[PDB]
Amino acid sequence: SLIVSTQRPSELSPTVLAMCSNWFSLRLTNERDLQALRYAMESGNEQILKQISGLPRGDAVAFGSAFNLPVRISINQARPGPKSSDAVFSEEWA
C-alpha cells in the first residue's frame, strides 16, 4: 500500500495519485490542489469537494468503500493530545 501526505497535489500525476481504496481529508487550501485532487478522484462526487477549503480543525470528510454515503465527521477529543512543540524563546535572551 501507499500513504502520501503531500502539501501541493497541484503538482502530482493524477494516475499515480488515484489508486487507493478510501481516503481522509482535513482542510486543503490551494485551489489548484483541490482541482488536481478532483482530477485524481475515482470514488466520489464533486459536491463534497467544495467544502474542504474551510474545514475547521477536527472536522474531516470521509468517503470510500466502508461508507454507504459520504459523511462529515467531527473527530473526538485528543486524549492524550499532542505535546511536542518548540522551546519557549523568552529564556534565550535572559
Next chain:
Amino acid sequence: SLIVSTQRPSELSPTVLAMCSNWFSLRLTNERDLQALRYAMESGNEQILKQISGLPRGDAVAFGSAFNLPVRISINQARPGPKSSDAVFSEEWANC
C-alpha cells in the same frame, strides 16, 4: 469484430468511438471521461448520459447494434459464482 476499451476516452480519436456499435458500462463517476462520448454520437439524443453516474449495484446500461434502442438491464447472478473473496485480515491480527 473488435473490442476497443477506454475508461478515459478523452485522449483518443472520436472516430474510434463513432465507428463502433456496442458498449457495456456499469456505474462510472468521472466528469472528464465522457467528452468523446459527448461528441461522437450524432444529433438526436444527449439526455441519456446523466443516469450512468448513479446506477445501483447490479445494474448496467447496454446499447449497440444488437439492441434496437438503448435499454437498462438488471443482470442476474451467475451460478456457480466466481471466486469467493480476497484475503481476510481478521484472522492474521487475532494474535492480540
